[PDB]
Subunit: 20 residues, 3 copies
């Protein structure tokens, strides 16, 4: 389970990042 | 099963990035 | 298969906006 939760967050962070 | 659930999230990140 | 289908749409949609 933790590998899925870390992968999902690492793949989403660049979208958020590019609005700031 | 969780590999598949993380891929669905990851994989749609380019839809968000194309909107904003 | 669905991740790939969605990626294709993300890249097609903005092309449409350049016509109209």
């Amino acid at each position: 389970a933790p590998a899925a939760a870390a992968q999902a967050v690492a793949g989403l962070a660049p979208v958020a990042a590019e609005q700031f």
